[PDB]
Design a binder for these strands. Sequence first.
RNA 1: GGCUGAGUAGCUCAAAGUAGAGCAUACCGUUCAAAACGGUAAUGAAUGUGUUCGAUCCACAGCUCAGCCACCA
RNA 2: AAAUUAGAUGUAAAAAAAAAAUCUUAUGAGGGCGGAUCCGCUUCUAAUAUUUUUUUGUAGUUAUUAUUAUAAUAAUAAUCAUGUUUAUUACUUAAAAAGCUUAAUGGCUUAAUCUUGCCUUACUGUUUGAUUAACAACAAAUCUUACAGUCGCGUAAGCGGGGCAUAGGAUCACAAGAUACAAAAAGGAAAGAUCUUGGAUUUUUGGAAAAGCUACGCUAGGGAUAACAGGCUAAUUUGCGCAAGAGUGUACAAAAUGAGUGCGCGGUUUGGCACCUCGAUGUCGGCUUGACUAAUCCUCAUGGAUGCAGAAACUAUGUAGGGUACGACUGUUCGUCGAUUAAAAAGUUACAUGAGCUGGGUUAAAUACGUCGUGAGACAGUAUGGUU
RNA 3: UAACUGUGCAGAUACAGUUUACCUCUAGUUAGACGAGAAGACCCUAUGCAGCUUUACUGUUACUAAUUAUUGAAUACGAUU
RNA 4: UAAAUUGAAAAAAAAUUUGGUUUCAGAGGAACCCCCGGUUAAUGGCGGCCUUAGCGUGAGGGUCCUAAGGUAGCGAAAUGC
RNA 5: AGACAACACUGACUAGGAUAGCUGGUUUUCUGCGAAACCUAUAAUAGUAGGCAAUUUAAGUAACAUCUUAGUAGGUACAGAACUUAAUCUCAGACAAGAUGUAGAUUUUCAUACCUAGGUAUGAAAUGCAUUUUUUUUUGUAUACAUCGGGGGAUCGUGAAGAUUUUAUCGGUGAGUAUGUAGACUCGGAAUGACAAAGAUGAAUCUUGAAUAAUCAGACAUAGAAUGAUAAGGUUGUAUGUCAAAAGGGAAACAGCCCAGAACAAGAGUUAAGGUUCCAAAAUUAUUAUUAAGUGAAAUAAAGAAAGUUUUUAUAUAAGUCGACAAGAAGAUGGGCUUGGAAGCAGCCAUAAUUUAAAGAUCUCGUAACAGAGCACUUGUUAAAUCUUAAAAGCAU
Lengths: 56, 168
Amino acid sequence: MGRDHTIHAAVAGYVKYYRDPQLHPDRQYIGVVFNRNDKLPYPKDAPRKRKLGLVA
Amino acid sequence: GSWLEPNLNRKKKMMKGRPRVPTGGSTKGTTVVWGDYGLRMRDHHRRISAQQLKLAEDTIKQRLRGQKYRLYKRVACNVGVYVSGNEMRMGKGKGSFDHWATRVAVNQIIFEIRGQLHEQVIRDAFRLAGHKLPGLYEFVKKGDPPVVGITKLEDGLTVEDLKNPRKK
RNA sequence: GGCUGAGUAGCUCAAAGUAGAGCAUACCGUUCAAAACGGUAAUGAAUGUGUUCGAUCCACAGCUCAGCCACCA
RNA sequence: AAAUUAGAUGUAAAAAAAAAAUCUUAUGAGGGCGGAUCCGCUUCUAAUAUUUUUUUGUAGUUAUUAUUAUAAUAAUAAUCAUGUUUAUUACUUAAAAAGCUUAAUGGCUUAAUCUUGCCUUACUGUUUGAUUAACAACAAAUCUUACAGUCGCGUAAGCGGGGCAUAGGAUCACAAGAUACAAAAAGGAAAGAUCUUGGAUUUUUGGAAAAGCUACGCUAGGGAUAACAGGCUAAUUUGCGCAAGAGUGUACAAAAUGAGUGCGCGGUUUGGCACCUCGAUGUCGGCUUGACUAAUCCUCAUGGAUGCAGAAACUAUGUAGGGUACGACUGUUCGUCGAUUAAAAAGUUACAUGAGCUGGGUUAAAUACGUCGUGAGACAGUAUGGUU
RNA sequence: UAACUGUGCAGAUACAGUUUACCUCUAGUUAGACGAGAAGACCCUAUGCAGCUUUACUGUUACUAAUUAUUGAAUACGAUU
RNA sequence: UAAAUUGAAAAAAAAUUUGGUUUCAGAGGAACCCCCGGUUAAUGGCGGCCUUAGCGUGAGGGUCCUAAGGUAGCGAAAUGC
RNA sequence: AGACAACACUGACUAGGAUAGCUGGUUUUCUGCGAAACCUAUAAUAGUAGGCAAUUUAAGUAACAUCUUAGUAGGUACAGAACUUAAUCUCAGACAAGAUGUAGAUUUUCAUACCUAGGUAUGAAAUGCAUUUUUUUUUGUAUACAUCGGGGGAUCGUGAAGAUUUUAUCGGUGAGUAUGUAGACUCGGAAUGACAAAGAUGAAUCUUGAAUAAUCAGACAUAGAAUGAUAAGGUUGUAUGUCAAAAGGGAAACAGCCCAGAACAAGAGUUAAGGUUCCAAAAUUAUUAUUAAGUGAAAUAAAGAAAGUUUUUAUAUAAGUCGACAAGAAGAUGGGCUUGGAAGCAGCCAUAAUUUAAAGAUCUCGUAACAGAGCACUUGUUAAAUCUUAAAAGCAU
Ligand SMILES: [K+]
Ligand SMILES: [K+]
Ligand SMILES: [K+]
Ligand SMILES: [K+]
Ligand SMILES: [K+]
Ligand SMILES: [K+]
Ligand SMILES: [K+]
Ligand SMILES: [K+]
Ligand SMILES: [K+]
Ligand SMILES: [K+]
Ligand SMILES: [Mg+2]
Ligand SMILES: [Mg+2]
Ligand SMILES: [Mg+2]
Ligand SMILES: [Mg+2]
Ligand SMILES: [Mg+2]
Ligand SMILES: [Mg+2]
Ligand SMILES: [Mg+2]
Ligand SMILES: [Mg+2]
Ligand SMILES: [Mg+2]
Ligand SMILES: [Mg+2]
Ligand SMILES: [Mg+2]
Ligand SMILES: [Mg+2]
Ligand SMILES: [Mg+2]
Ligand SMILES: [Mg+2]
Ligand SMILES: [Mg+2]
Ligand SMILES: [Mg+2]
Ligand SMILES: [Mg+2]
Ligand SMILES: [Mg+2]
Ligand SMILES: [Mg+2]
Ligand SMILES: [Mg+2]
Ligand SMILES: [Mg+2]
Ligand SMILES: [Mg+2]
Ligand SMILES: [Mg+2]
Ligand SMILES: [Mg+2]
Ligand SMILES: [Mg+2]
Ligand SMILES: [Mg+2]
Ligand SMILES: [Mg+2]
Ligand SMILES: [Mg+2]
Ligand SMILES: [Mg+2]
Ligand SMILES: [Mg+2]
């Protein structure tokens, strides 16, 4: 989130508009997933899906 | 305030606006809820002024004076009409306050009366009040069905039968 | 028709942390009586509603208003 | 009426176990099969969630009551408690409002608010990706990323390139610091260049140092734009009708009369719009000469009239053939007035008619009065004169 | 090179519909051809002009004031110090 | 900036004096102006409010302000909406 | 007198040296493509620049457009009254127990007197209706303990004071899943439109390189708004199209409307909008109703009136509907009051009865007041075998 409350992308992925009732009951979030077919919010018990983002 | 002079500020101007035109099957305000009889506008939606409604009440009181009745008003003059001079030119802002008014939809009740009087004595009172009000009015009893648009829900007709694309 | 400036004691006029000073009025005393005179007292911020810690004061809408502009065919 | 202080929701805190099913997930079994970790199909296992689901268990401790032989069993009640009871901890307590630098809007209560400790990243250079390619261009802007340098806070993770967000104008010139670039013969210097920074109603705020008259006026243009008339419109009118009936009429609504209203016609007023005409549509009254409309002043036929005895008159229905004159006042249309008359009504036609006339008014040059302006001058202020 | 009503850049000899009219001159007359004449003086526009006005901006002068120079003395009186 | 002196004398400036060059600086010191006064047949300017011998009228009496408050005369006027 | 200074003078004539963001004009043909009247800036608004973007022809395309399937953003119409706004309506209070009284029935239980455990006596209680109870000197339960002032009246009362109760009076407060209201209310919520992904289709329609314009006075129709006056061929936005720059057919005539995009000819060719008796190409084509007014027939004049007509739905009728005609339409009683007078009939109050085939203490006239004539209502006669009355709707006047 920016200084003026602007939501940017931190990684190369696909935008998602969802609600996470576990984190906060009355909030709506925006996220970026690496796979277009992913579904947010991820289950709290699933491993973090992260990309390397490095070149050898 | 009152039903002809609300507790609003004349400084803050209002737009012209338009009366409510229910196009979704709304019977809001088309029935007698308090009195035994009513006065229904049955031609078109308008914007009645506080001066035309004040004369209607005075016309009913003059005809029913000396008798026991209870007149209910189902409309409130809560729309401030602002008029610029008919001699002025176009532009130079909006006009100044002229009078209070109320927007009435079609087939909506205006007045309702409840008293120990004869039906025909009330008809003449509502008949005289209609000749001095803008538009055409109708005598309505209590218990009769509501009106969706310009069609009455009579003979088992429901709002879903009017929404059904097939009617023939 | 269209803008502007004013409104405080009975009468005058002065003044966002105040309402003052005159004249008039009243009581008494001076004179045979009255006036003048002398002494001692009491009198107000229009009409609401807002702003402000607090409004004669700033803002807004009415009443009273006065003043000014209503030009070219 | 208005000063301070103390209050203003409820719940939980011994503890579960097991069976199946419906999905969803898995960087689980490197599952299997087609093409270890790539992809669509795929069983199994695990986890979260969901069924009102099939249930099982709900004790122990203290005490009471009853039975049984102080103990056992059953039921009932209380039970967060090894802990300074001012307990404590977790969860819950609508919305609005308060607070968050200033208006308004949105947002924050799990922090962007408040309290306290230590601090001053309100850092230097460069740089990424965006604002569906900022403002429907450019520029001045806004948010964000990374590397290097070196500082703060924090156990740590990490956070920090000012403030919860959205409202502070350049260049030039000028002034203060730095860089070591160039130095018009040469050594210096001056005056320049780069980097950082300051002083602006440059408020016509993409940024000129800036008052009026013209009726003596001129040129280039405009029906892209006013005055006259036409067109559209019909608020309004000095033009009318219909409906209803408060009330007046000694009585009795509708003989007459008709509050405040409603539904309309009409195109004769004042307006609104700016469609035609500014390489040109002459204008208020008067005279002359018409034509037409009918919402009728007179004349003709006629209904109603406690309020039509007669007469006269009122009102209304037919009806526009003819007539509606004279004079004083005013530029006047209009209007006032005198005296006659059967009566001395109106309107449309470019408010009919100036290539038919007149020119008194309005509206040029001259001049004066009053008023306004510092003045030149101006004036729906008034005067005398002024190529038709 | 007719009349009416309607239409239309919104007032038609020329368009629509209907009506009326044998061809062609002469003398009269001026209702229309938004008749002719003068690229509207009115009004507005142009970062167009001209003259005039003033405590408009920026300037030049008449005029006023001081002084080097042409130009030398002498007492004073006095002040700076 | 040149020379000299001084200083530094380490990779070194820096300061003073003089020549040349280029800036800052103002005790005293004119008119207009400031200050004082005069001038209206100079340009020009020449006001409000309440109160009353009864209603009335307002001689009279209250006060505010100005440089002064329009005097004589004229007056629905070439001036009056 | 801005008067005159030789056509000209608010500054002559003549020679030399201008500009004009303004108006007007710009000359042959064929062929291809094809705008705009918008945004931003401008001492700028009838000018200009940069964009959007027209053109040329090269290189690219996982281009562009459209549909399908899945997904996302956002709150309009609508609907609703939650939050907020205006106004209006209803309510502001109940049960259980206990307690406090009364007429009883005189049975049972209990407490006393006893008596000899019952009975004999004395009290209470039970049983039935009242009474007290939302803050009371009445606790509990359920709920928002659930309401505060002005004023009016009444009953007390003090030297003026005020104190204490009531109201279907005004304002305020609380409750309501009560009614309405909406540019700055949206709890609920479309379609449309927008964004991106894959697939498919299609007329290259897209992007970039190079080269390089015009336009920046728009108009109307339809929908929905602001403004005006719910006027304008009005002004200003939005959505779509046409005109502009588009001829042709239809709308009598026609920039903007309904169709349809003109390269040139032929055809009783095939069709759109629109039409088919004649002018004038094609039906005097079939079916069922309505209208009698030339209504109307290609630009709907309103409210409103009415034995116009038709249909439908009710309803009356040989138990004689409907209409007419004949008679009756009483009595207590001139109701009471008022009034000079009020007898049904100026006005005020009352208007349970009585007797009848039926008859209002009275609906329209009449009288100074009575009288009198009609009506409601009642009987009879005449007489209809699809034929009464009223309403609604359709088309007409
Ligand atoms: K801190
Ligand atoms: K050099
Ligand atoms: K003369
Ligand atoms: K034209
Ligand atoms: K002529
Ligand atoms: K221009
Ligand atoms: K072509
Ligand atoms: K083409
Ligand atoms: K919503
Ligand atoms: K006809
Ligand atoms: Mg009406
Ligand atoms: Mg803060
Ligand atoms: Mg852009
Ligand atoms: Mg600007
Ligand atoms: Mg800008
Ligand atoms: Mg003159
Ligand atoms: Mg025009
Ligand atoms: Mg008669
Ligand atoms: Mg004749
Ligand atoms: Mg004329
Ligand atoms: Mg003529
Ligand atoms: Mg015509
Ligand atoms: Mg022809
Ligand atoms: Mg002639
Ligand atoms: Mg012609
Ligand atoms: Mg000096
Ligand atoms: Mg001196
Ligand atoms: Mg005088
Ligand atoms: Mg002159
Ligand atoms: Mg001359
Ligand atoms: Mg366009
Ligand atoms: Mg500029
Ligand atoms: Mg228009
Ligand atoms: Mg226009
Ligand atoms: Mg054009
Ligand atoms: Mg066409
Ligand atoms: Mg035809
Ligand atoms: Mg054929
Ligand atoms: Mg034929
Ligand atoms: Mg009586």
